[PDB]
Amino acid sequence: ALTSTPRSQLNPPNWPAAQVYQENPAPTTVLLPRDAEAEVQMTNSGAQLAGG
Amino acid sequence: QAAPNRPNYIGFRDNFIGLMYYNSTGNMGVLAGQASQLNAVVDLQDRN
């Protein structure tokens, strides 16, 4: 009575989308390495960017 | 009669010229951080 969500029928056949353990993960912040605008401008200028 | 044979010494090129694959794009080397294997040495056929 302190660990069971009040049900209407034991072993209910379809646990709804609210009383079941959804997992929220923290938003995945990615550090986009590069700015394509500057890379394209530099490569057009004649440079030949190459490396990590 | 008979003679000597012409002499030919046969030794490795100066500064070992040619032992490593320079200026050849096919067998070019690489030097990149252990991650992001993006090459960092890009060779051509014009810079000799």
DSSP per-residue codes, A21-37: ---PPPP--------HH
Please report the DSSP string for B19-40 in residue order. TS--S-STT------SSS---S
A6 touches chain B (CB under 8 A): no
Contact predicate A51/B40, CB 8 Å: yes
Distance CA(A50)–CA(B41), nearest Å, equals 7
Q: How many helices (H) and strands (E) does chain B have?
A: 0, 0
Name the minimum distance, in Å, from the CA of A3 to any CA of chain B.
48
Reported resolution, Å: 3.8
Q: How would you label A30-43 residue by residue, b for 16+ Cβ within 10 Å and e otherwise?
A: eeeeeeeeeeeeee
The letter for the amino acid at B4 is P
Q: Do B33 and A52 touch (CB under 8 A)?
A: yes
CA distance A38 to A52: 16
Which technique was used to obtain these atomic coordinates?
cryo-EM
Closest residue on chain A to B35 (Cα): A52
